[PDB]
Amino acid sequence: KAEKSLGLSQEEVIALFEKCRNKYKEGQKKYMEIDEALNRLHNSLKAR
Amino acid sequence: FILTMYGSKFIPFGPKCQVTEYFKDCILDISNETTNDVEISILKGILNLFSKIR
Amino acid sequence: LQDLKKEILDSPRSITSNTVAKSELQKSIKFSGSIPEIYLDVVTKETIS
Amino acid sequence: SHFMKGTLLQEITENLLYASAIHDSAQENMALHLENLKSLKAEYEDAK
Numbered sequence A: 001k002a003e004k005s006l007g008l009s010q011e012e013v014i015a016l017f018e019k020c021r022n023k024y025k026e027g028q029k030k031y032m033e034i035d036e037a038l039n040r041l042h043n044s045l046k047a048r
Numbered sequence B: 001f002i003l004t005m006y007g008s009k010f011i012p013f014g015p016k017c018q019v020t021e022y023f024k025d026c027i028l029d030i031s032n033e034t035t036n037d038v039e040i041s042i043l044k045g046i047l048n049l050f051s052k053i054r
Numbered sequence C: 001l002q003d004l005k006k007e008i009l010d011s012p013r014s015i016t017s018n019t020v021a022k023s024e025l026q027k028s029i030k031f032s033g034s035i036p037e038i039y040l041d042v043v044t045k046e047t048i049s
Numbered sequence D: 001s002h003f004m005k006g007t008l009l010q011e012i013t014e015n016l017l018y019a020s021a022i023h024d025s026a027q028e029n030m031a032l033h034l035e036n037l038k039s040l041k042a043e044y045e046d047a048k
Helices: A002-006 A010-047 B018-030 B038-052 C002-010 C019-027 C037-044 D002-006 D010-047
Strands: none
Touching: A002 A010, A010 C002, A010 D010, B018 B038, C019 C037, D002 D010
16 A cells, blocks of 8 residues: 555665665765866956 | 065166066066966066166 | 665755855954845955955 | 967967856856756655
8 A cells, every 4th residue: 555655666766765865966076066166267267 | 575675775666677677587487377376467567567667 | 775774864865165254254243234245255255365 | 469469468368268158158057057956956855
C-alpha cells in the first residue's frame, strides 16, 4: 500500500536521492568555483 | 613614500635628475600592463608628472 | 540503505562573498539612521584601495 | 587608430574588451546556473 501510494520503488527513490545529493554537491562545488572565478575576473577587470 | 619625498631639496622636480630617471626605469621594468597592481600605474604617472615639472 | 540514509539525513540536504564582513560592519556602526545596504556593499567590496 | 596601435594601447583595449565580454557572458551563464541550481535545489527538496 505504501509502495502504490509512493508509486516508485523505495530502492529506486533512495538511489535517486543519493544521485541527487551527489549532483547537488557537484553543482554546489561548480557554483562556488564559477562564483570565485567571476569575482577574481571582476577584480582583475577593475584593476586592468 | 614617493609622494612624501618629492618636492624637497633631496628629491626636487626636474627632467635632468638621475633619481627620478632610476625610479621611472624601475617602474617600467616591473610594469607589464596586463596583470599589475594599480599602484604601479599610479606611480608611473606621478613620476612622469614630477619629471615634467621644472 | 535505510541506516545509510538515516546518517545521510543527519548531513544537511538541499554567494556570501562578503556577508560576514558586511554583517560585522553593520553590527558595529555607532549610527542611529537608515545605513543603506549599498553603502555597506561599496565599503566592504573595495579589494584595491 | 594609428596612435593607439603605435603606443601598444590598442592591444590592451582589445584584451580588456574581450575579457569584459567573457565576464558578461560568464555573469549571464552564472545567473542561468543560479536559476538551474535553485530549480535543482527545489527538486532535491522534493526528493528530501
